[PDB]
Design a protein around this ligand. Structure first.
Ligand SMILES: CO[C@H]1O[C@H](CO)[C@@H](O)[C@H](O)[C@@H]1O
Ligand SMILES: CO[C@H]1O[C@H](CO)[C@@H](O)[C@H](O)[C@@H]1O
Ligand SMILES: [Ca+2]
Ligand SMILES: [Ca+2]
Ligand SMILES: [Mn+2]
Ligand SMILES: [Mn+2]
Lengths: 240, 240
């Protein structure tokens, strides 16, 4: 299809079009990307991802068209600690993508250790909400919580300082305009606190014509829940 | 997802989200439901169907909601014979639906001979464009080409006279309003000729909560091409 859209105001237990990978599962009408115990508390060493089953036509070589897409979602992070880790990310990748071996903790379940910073060895575009930046383990991160745009590497091509608020939902809007090639990210808390980051990228030189979209989250030695509360997505192939 | 929509203005050969059954295949940016030889001419004894891969949430028992959906599509039929057969149908059925054994010809690839008229043995809602009505073989049909609404039986709960026009595209809009429970069908030819038929049906008592949507066509002894040219579909769960 030239156009595709779907909306999940909430996440009921009976899902049919979601691919669950790792520890991801539905609980209380929301997607818990990372594992939790019987009482709902986060645990260490856990990775989980979800992808929508239908493939998205991102660009078409024959017609020279590229899709304009918009992804709106909200999530909340909770932790008995304060140094919650490691973060959640919205990502776009080839349809057969699976959790790479040893991609836990700071790699967010998106990259393999040996190639995490090798741009010619990956095919992924992601928007990360990174809460852990210890310079000994996450050597690629700026020294503060941040939202970043990742293009084939865990070392973001662009970041903006961000504030982690335990238990508060963050509303996010990610848009890609093929005309200007800008990937824009706008995140806001209910009180109006806003964060923005953008970057120019030609998706055609990074990803295949057909892709899958979804979310990934992980917790290494430090932990927190990564609760995806709602998600809507729309893509339309356009001539520019 | 509570809402889902997709649009195929045309059908490029590079498809990823369509389930092809029987002889259905893409040719010249269109879906040829029934088999055609190397010259593009229709042949006898063929059946084909296509379904969108993602499942549609038609209704939700827990929330007491039912979907409002709209399906817009265009197709054309062509045959050198004076009595092209058998017809094409837009249908909604359980996700695991497959072509029934011996469902060729007048059964349109939708029903098995032994239960074709047993409403308690089927789970399907279809809108058929039936061009073959020989009273000796298709005993259930009115004696003329027709558009019919089928609910668990090849014997339409309702039909209206229709004119078959060789090689001319028919544009159709099928809508279902959960508030009135009306399934409306409006079909038009490019010269303004219009056909309309409506039927009241509670989809909750006929189909499961999750379904798949698609098209089916067949040719028995008589034949014609059944070419699906475009298709857009949208569904959203609403409070009833
Ligand atoms: C100590 O390092 C581990 O724990 C931190 C915090 O969870 C992760 O960022 C890192 O990748 C390792 O898994
Ligand atoms: C003669 O009967 C056969 O051919 C007609 C026309 O194709 C079909 O309607 C029917 O089901 C049989 O297959
Ligand atoms: Ca980090
Ligand atoms: Ca018939
Ligand atoms: Mn980071
Ligand atoms: Mn009929």
């Amino acid at each position: 299809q030239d156009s595709l859209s779907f909306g999940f105001p909430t996440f009921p237990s009976d899902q049919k079009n979601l691919i669950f990978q790792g520890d991801a599962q539905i609980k209380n009408n929301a997607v818990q990307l990372t594992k939790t115990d019987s009482n709902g508390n986060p645990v260490a060493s856990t990775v989980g991802r979800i992808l929508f089953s239908a493939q998205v036509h991102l660009w078409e070589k024959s017609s020279s068209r590229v899709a304009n897409f918009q992804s709106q979602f909200s999530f909340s992070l909770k932790s008995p600690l304060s140094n919650g880790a490691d973060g959640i990310a919205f990502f776009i990748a080839p349809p057969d993508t699976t959790i790479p071996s040893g991609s836990g903790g700071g790699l967010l379940g998106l990259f393999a250790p040996g190639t995490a910073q090798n741009t010619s060895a990956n095919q992924v575009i992601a928007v990360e909400f990174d809460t852990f930046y210890a310079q000994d383990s996450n050597t690629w991160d700026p020294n503060y919580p941040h939202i970043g745009i990742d293009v084939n590497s865990i070392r973001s091509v662009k970041t903006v300082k961000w504030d982690r608020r335990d238990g508060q939902s963050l509303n996010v809007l990610v848009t890609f305009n093929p005309s200007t090639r800008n990937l824009d990210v706008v995140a806001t808390y209910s009180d109006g606190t806003r964060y923005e980051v953008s970057y120019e990228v030609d998706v055609r030189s990074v990803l295949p014509e057909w892709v899958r979209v979804g979310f990934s989250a992980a917790s290494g030695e430090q932990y927190q829940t990564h609760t995806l509360e709602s998600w809507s997505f729309t893509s339309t192939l356009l001539y520019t």
